[PDB]
Design a protein around this ligand. Structure first.
Ligand SMILES: O=P(O)(O)OP(=O)(O)OP(=O)(O)OC[C@H]1O[C@@H](n2cnc3c(NCCc4ccccc4)ncnc32)[C@H](O)[C@@H]1O
Length: 375
């Protein structure tokens, strides 16, 4: 019975605590990942991203149920459970002995097998320089190896162990550029049909994810696509994460609610009234809100019904896009406008489309957008 098989993982009310009598960083967490899914892990500074990955490996006091391919984490040994995962970057353990042993601790592999994995992870040349090749003894914690060499050995170890779930704890951050690329290369090659949990600080190097997993305060929401994350951020953090330049935020007051709508007024001496195709639940009339609108979605003057005007402070020419920073006097703040593929000072005018406005409460959470964006 070859385990793991696909890479599917289910989580039921997970509680991760560092000390037996400490404080729980993750209260009660449930989710499920389909086999062979590349999942982006997101969260605010300190929310518990690294802790989740540490809880997967059971490296702290853990309560609840984790299951890979319908097998619980309670009827299997730590080292067997950890063999299912390929963790890089990793606290590198280089064992006392030879290259062969460090790659194949169980002695369960042919020398030809070891060389094959070594070659595909770029270790062939690293091993060859040393007298005994595979027979060469690695002294003093593997002090002849660079940081990257050591990570490639952890990786090779996992390819050889045939791991099925990969835990990338900010790889681009903690790796050599030359090492990091090989990791991405073997990711689409050796671990092509594997669950990958990419955790990083920038969406630029997460652009290829089928799924996302964002850590809230108590729950973990999961977005089925980049499109979902872009159009329907369930909080103000997620709204700022995707799309550049950042989403414009406007302070607004709720003048009215409805059944499936919310009305707000602009913060300005112009204080205009506008309805928003946004969920009405948990919205008290009079409350303070933050209206979100992307620079991408802002219409030109001649187009919309709700119009704004101001003097241009910055015209940023990038070639494939043009960024217009408009200092609007009506509203006491700037408004960044954008359009695909006009100098500083002159009066610009932008239209704000109610259909594509996000709405955020004081706490940060978003009122669900009801407008159905195609795709
Ligand atoms: O990396 P960021 O900044 O983007 O944020 P994040 O990834 O969402 O946050 P995490 O790094 O998960 O940190 C989340 C909280 O968990 C606590 N915490 C984290 N590490 C802690 C620790 N480590 C001791 C050694 C150890 C033990 C077992 C496993 C790994 C490390 N011993 C005790 N408390 C530890 C601490 O209160 C942190 O504020």
């Amino acid at each position: 019975d070859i385990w793991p098989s696909g890479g599917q993982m289910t989580v039921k009310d997970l509680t991760a605590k560092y000390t037996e009598g400490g404080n729980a960083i993750l209260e009660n967490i449930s989710f499920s990942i389909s086999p062979g899914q590349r999942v982006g892990l997101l969260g605010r500074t300190g929310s518990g991203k690294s802790t989740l990955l540490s809880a997967f490996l059971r490296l702290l006091n853990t309560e609840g149920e984790i299951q890979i391919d319908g097998v619980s984490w309670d009827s299997i040994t730590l080292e067997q459970w950890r063999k299912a995962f390929g963790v890089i970057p990793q606290k590198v353990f280089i064992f006392s002995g030879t290259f062969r042993k460090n790659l194949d601790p169980n002695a369960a592999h042919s020398d030809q097998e070891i060389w094959k994995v070594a070659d595909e992870v770029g270790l062939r040349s690293v091993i060859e320089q040393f007298p005994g090749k595979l027979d060469f003894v690695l002294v003093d914690g593997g002090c002849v190896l660079s940081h990257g060499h050591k990570q490639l050995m952890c990786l090779a170890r996992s390819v050889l162990s045939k791991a099925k779930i990969l835990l990338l704890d900010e790889p681009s951050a903690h790796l050599d550029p030359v090492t990091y690329q090989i990791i991405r290369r073997t990711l689409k090659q050796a671990f092509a049909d594997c669950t990958v949990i990419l955790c990083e600080a920038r969406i630029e190097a997460m652009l290829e994810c089928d799924q996302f997993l964002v850590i809230e305060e108590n729950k973990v929401r999961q977005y089925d696509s980049i499109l979902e994350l872009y159009h329907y951020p369930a909080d103000r953090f997620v709204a700022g994460f995707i799309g550049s330049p950042k989403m414009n935020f406007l302070p607004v007051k709720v003048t009215a609610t409805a059944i499936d709508q919310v009305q707000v007024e602009l913060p300005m001496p112009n204080r205009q009234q506008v309805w928003l195709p946004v969920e009405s639940r948990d919205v008290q009339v009079g409350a303070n809100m933050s209206l979100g609108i992307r620079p991408e979605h802002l219409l030109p003057s001649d187009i919309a019904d709700v119009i704004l005007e101001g003097e241009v402070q910055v015209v940023e020419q990038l070639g494939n896009e043009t960024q217009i920073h408009i200092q609007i006097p009506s509203i006491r703040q700037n408004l960044v406008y954008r359009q695909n593929d006009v100098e500083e000072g002159a009066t610009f005018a932008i239209g704000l489309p109610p259909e594509r406005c996000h709405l955020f409460r004081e706490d940060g959470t978003a009122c669900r957008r009801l407008h159905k964006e195609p795709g």
